[PDB]
Design an enzyme around this catalytic site. Structure first.
Site, PDB file in Angstrom:
ATOM      1  N   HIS A  30       0.643  -1.423   0.027  1.00 36.79           N
ATOM      2  CA  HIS A  30      -0.110   0.036  -0.004  1.00 36.79           C
ATOM      3  C   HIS A  30       0.836   1.278   0.090  1.00 36.79           C
ATOM      4  O   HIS A  30       1.713   1.350   0.663  1.00 36.79           O
ATOM      5  CB  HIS A  30      -0.999   0.010   1.164  1.00 36.79           C
ATOM      6  CG  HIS A  30      -2.056  -1.102   1.017  1.00 36.79           C
ATOM      7  ND1 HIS A  30      -2.475  -1.668   2.089  1.00 36.79           N
ATOM      8  CD2 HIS A  30      -2.747  -1.350   0.249  1.00 36.79           C
ATOM      9  CE1 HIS A  30      -3.252  -2.568   1.818  1.00 36.79           C
ATOM     10  NE2 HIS A  30      -3.577  -2.250   0.416  1.00 36.79           N
TER      11      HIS A  30
ATOM     12  N   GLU B 250       1.935   3.736   3.180  1.00 39.29           N
ATOM     13  CA  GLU B 250       2.350   3.077   4.359  1.00 39.29           C
ATOM     14  C   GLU B 250       3.908   3.178   4.260  1.00 39.29           C
ATOM     15  O   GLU B 250       4.621   1.850   4.295  1.00 39.29           O
ATOM     16  CB  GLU B 250       1.776   1.612   4.243  1.00 39.29           C
ATOM     17  CG  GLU B 250       0.321   1.697   4.759  1.00 39.29           C
ATOM     18  CD  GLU B 250      -0.378   0.169   4.380  1.00 39.29           C
ATOM     19  OE1 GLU B 250      -1.524  -0.036   4.373  1.00 39.29           O
ATOM     20  OE2 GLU B 250       0.207  -0.770   4.474  1.00 39.29           O
TER      21      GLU B 250
ATOM     22  N   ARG C 200      -3.296   4.930  -2.227  1.00 40.54           N
ATOM     23  CA  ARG C 200      -3.378   3.467  -1.503  1.00 40.54           C
ATOM     24  C   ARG C 200      -3.118   2.557  -2.461  1.00 40.54           C
ATOM     25  O   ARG C 200      -2.319   1.719  -2.388  1.00 40.54           O
ATOM     26  CB  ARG C 200      -4.522   3.151  -0.533  1.00 40.54           C
ATOM     27  CG  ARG C 200      -4.838   1.545  -0.436  1.00 40.54           C
ATOM     28  CD  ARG C 200      -6.055   1.712   0.412  1.00 40.54           C
ATOM     29  NE  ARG C 200      -6.462   0.135   0.604  1.00 40.54           N
ATOM     30  CZ  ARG C 200      -6.279  -0.415   1.604  1.00 40.54           C
ATOM     31  NH1 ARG C 200      -5.516   0.083   2.608  1.00 40.54           N
ATOM     32  NH2 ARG C 200      -6.588  -1.908   1.696  1.00 40.54           N
TER      33      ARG C 200
ATOM     34  N   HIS D 206       2.818  -3.944   6.785  1.00 48.89           N
ATOM     35  CA  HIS D 206       1.961  -2.906   6.411  1.00 48.89           C
ATOM     36  C   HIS D 206       2.040  -1.817   7.338  1.00 48.89           C
ATOM     37  O   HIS D 206       2.893  -1.981   8.547  1.00 48.89           O
ATOM     38  CB  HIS D 206       0.550  -3.358   6.258  1.00 48.89           C
ATOM     39  CG  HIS D 206       0.170  -4.083   4.973  1.00 48.89           C
ATOM     40  ND1 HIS D 206      -0.612  -3.693   4.270  1.00 48.89           N
ATOM     41  CD2 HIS D 206       0.732  -5.241   4.588  1.00 48.89           C
ATOM     42  CE1 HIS D 206      -0.740  -4.593   3.227  1.00 48.89           C
ATOM     43  NE2 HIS D 206       0.237  -5.548   3.542  1.00 48.89           N
TER      44      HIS D 206
ATOM     45  N   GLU E 229       1.428  -5.156  10.852  1.00 49.73           N
ATOM     46  CA  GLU E 229       1.106  -3.651  11.038  1.00 49.73           C
ATOM     47  C   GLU E 229       2.003  -3.010  12.010  1.00 49.73           C
ATOM     48  O   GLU E 229       1.754  -3.245  13.106  1.00 49.73           O
ATOM     49  CB  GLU E 229      -0.330  -3.648  11.380  1.00 49.73           C
ATOM     50  CG  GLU E 229      -1.256  -4.291  10.426  1.00 49.73           C
ATOM     51  CD  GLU E 229      -1.663  -3.306   9.171  1.00 49.73           C
ATOM     52  OE1 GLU E 229      -1.119  -2.054   9.109  1.00 49.73           O
ATOM     53  OE2 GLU E 229      -2.228  -3.943   8.124  1.00 49.73           O
TER      54      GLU E 229
ATOM     55  N   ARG F   6      -6.496  -6.834  -1.984  1.00 51.99           N
ATOM     56  CA  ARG F   6      -7.853  -7.459  -2.286  1.00 51.99           C
ATOM     57  C   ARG F   6      -7.768  -8.039  -3.654  1.00 51.99           C
ATOM     58  O   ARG F   6      -8.947  -8.397  -4.195  1.00 51.99           O
ATOM     59  CB  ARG F   6      -8.863  -6.580  -2.640  1.00 51.99           C
ATOM     60  CG  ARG F   6      -8.979  -5.542  -1.108  1.00 51.99           C
ATOM     61  CD  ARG F   6      -9.551  -6.242  -0.009  1.00 51.99           C
ATOM     62  NE  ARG F   6      -9.713  -5.557   1.324  1.00 51.99           N
ATOM     63  CZ  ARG F   6      -8.905  -5.048   2.106  1.00 51.99           C
ATOM     64  NH1 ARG F   6      -7.724  -5.688   1.836  1.00 51.99           N
ATOM     65  NH2 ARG F   6      -9.231  -4.295   2.997  1.00 51.99           N
TER      66      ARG F   6
END
Ligand SMILES: CC(C)[C@H](NS(=O)(=O)c1ccccc1)P(=O)(O)C[C@H](C(=O)O)c1cccc(CN)c1
Ligand SMILES: [Zn+2]
Length: 304
Positions: free
Chosen positions: A64, A67, A122, A192, A266, A140
């Site tokens: 992403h 990030e 993103r 991420h 994360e 996704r």
């Protein structure tokens, strides 16, 4: 020029992949595994002491675009590996026994866009038929309960799942590489931000992985180790309940390929700065994260 305690633009990261490799040919080789929609080169660094066969751990950053601490960590990881090989016992054995396949930035086109136009972008930057809207959510876009939950079929949305699984050149490139090297890849790690979590499958369904107990015990140990350095607290668990259901993720897809240790990290923080983490935290964030990655690595090696 390049700095490990600043966020670097793609031109700089690209030149860095060439330099760090040129300066450490006995520990790093660079290959390109494909091109992005806009023609940027998707580099992969094979980090480790060359040898026959060898198992591997795959790690990517920069899924992403916004990030940025993710991109920073893959670079930090590579320097750590090269500087300490031969001096730190664990890293030495790690690089002797296995390879890390490190992919410093997957979504290069989006990353560039965050530098040039919109810091909060993103998705990828590919065009979509029949609309002016741009981009697909790469996390996704994998064949894992593709677009069944937590995703959008609308090109204008931030979670657009694409025309089909692996519709994006970048996600296809990553999946192709992992499929081509399945026999050797023992763990998959995707980086991420933000939220301070370690996640494991599944995210596309509330069902639990067959080795759920082991993964939970691994994640728990890894977050404990991470906290030892600066006291940073992570939470952990299956994706679906620890954050929210989201189909089409790379980690779920890697797991269903038979890669039994699959994790999403994360990194910092918890929302004070969010995606816009100050450069003054790059060092500390990467340092504590290294501890968790090496812990997982130590574990995976012992359970080959
Ligand atoms: C702050 C983070 C939690 C990111 N979420 S986000 O950008 O705020 C967001 C906001 C609205 C919709 C979708 C994502 P993320 O890194 O982008 C979370 C990630 C994803 O949405 O792809 C995620 C979510 C659920 C499960 C997994 C593991 N496959 C990974
Ligand atoms: Zn993300």
């Amino acid at each position: 020029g390049h700095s490990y305690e600043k966020y670097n633009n793609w031109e700089t990261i690209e030149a860095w992949t060439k330099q760090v490799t040129s300066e450490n040919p006995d520990l790093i080789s660079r290959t390109a595994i494909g091109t992005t929609f806009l023609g940027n080169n998707i580099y992969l660094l094979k980090v480790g002491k060359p040898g026959p066969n060898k198992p591997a751990i795959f790690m990517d950053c920069g899924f992403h675009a916004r990030e940025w601490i993710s991109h920073a960590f893959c670079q930090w990881f590579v320097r750590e590996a090269v500087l300490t090989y031969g001096y730190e016992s664990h890293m030495t054995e790690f690089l002797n026994k296995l390879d890390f396949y490190v992919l410093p930035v997957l979504n290069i086109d989006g990353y560039i866009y965050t530098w040039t136009k919109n810091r909060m972008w993103r998705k990828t930057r590919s065009t979509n038929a029949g609309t002016t809207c741009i981009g697909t959510d790469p996390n996704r876009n994998f064949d894992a309960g593709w677009c069944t939950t937590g995703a959008s079929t609308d090109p204008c949305d931030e979670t657009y799942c694409g025309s089909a699984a692996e519709s994006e050149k970048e996600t296809k490139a990553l999946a192709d590489f992992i499929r081509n090297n399945l026999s050797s890849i023992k763990a998959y790690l995707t980086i991420h931000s933000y939220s301070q979590m370690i996640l494991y499958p599944y995210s596309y369904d509330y069902k639990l992985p067959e080795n759920n107990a082991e993964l939970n015990n691994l994640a728990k140990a890894a977050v404990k180790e991470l906290a030892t350095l600066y006291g940073t607290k992570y939470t952990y668990g299956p994706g679906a309940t620890t954050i929210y259901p989201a189909a089409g993720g790379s980690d779920d897809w890697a797991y269903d390929q038979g890669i039994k240790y699959s994790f999403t990290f994360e990194l910092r923080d918890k929302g004070r700065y969010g995606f816009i983490l100050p450069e003054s935290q790059i060092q500390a964030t990467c340092e504590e994260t290294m501890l968790a990655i090496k812990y997982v690595t130590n574990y995976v090696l012992g359970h080959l």
